Design a protein around this ligand. Structure first.
Ligand code: S1S
Ligand code: S1S
Length: 93
């Protein structure tokens, strides 16, 4: 879509997002090294972060595997992330 900028090099992607107002300004581009792969470049305060768009064996896309080592970690995550897939819900007594 409109966030998609195809073969824009990494450098010029950072050049571009660097001249943008707010944090979280982004685009997706083809990976510099990996044929058929995508990179997400995101303006965040003073730098540009680059993420590799991961794929699994079924061909789905993700940035990271969301799993936790404890119940505590799971609870702290979902105090700012919704527990529900279709409703916004957080946290408690
Ligand atoms: N989605 C993610 O990128 C979560 C990851 N990254 C991080 O935590 C980050 C998050 C932003 C703040 C800095 C640290 N980033 C990084 O580690 C890196 C850091 C970087 O910017 O060099 C990130 C990255 C590497 C290279 C590119 C590059 C390309 O595709 O050739 C490009 O510009 O097109 C883009 C991004 C990816 C590493 C891959 C990852 C290892 C890896 C996984 C799967 C496939 C390959 C394939 C080839 C090499 C490495 C990997 C580790 N990094 C992470 O998993
Ligand atoms: N982009 C979205 O937000 C859409 C969905 N995803 C979610 O709600 C999510 C992600 C956002 C945060 C809440 C959990 N994910 C999921 O629901 C899930 C599953 C879940 O329990 O978290 C998502 C999913 C299933 C399977 C894999 C698996 C594989 O594909 O073989 C793998 O590991 O790669 C991965 C993911 C199921 C989708 C079916 C969906 C039901 C469905 C819709 C349309 C067509 C079909 C067709 C067949 C079965 C189900 C559906 C429900 N999930 C969503 O609709």
């Amino acid at each position: 879509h409109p966030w998609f900028f195809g073969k824009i090099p990494r450098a010029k992607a950072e050049e571009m997002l660097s001249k943008q107002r707010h944090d979280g300004a982004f685009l997706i581009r083809e990976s510099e090294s990996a044929p058929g792969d995508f990179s997400l470049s995101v303006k965040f305060g003073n730098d540009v972060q680059h993420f590799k768009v991961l794929r699994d064996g079924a061909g789905k896309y993700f940035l990271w595997v969301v799993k936790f080592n404890s119940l505590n970690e799971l609870v702290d995550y979902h105090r700012s992330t919704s527990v529900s897939r279709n409703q916004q819900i957080f946290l408690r007594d």
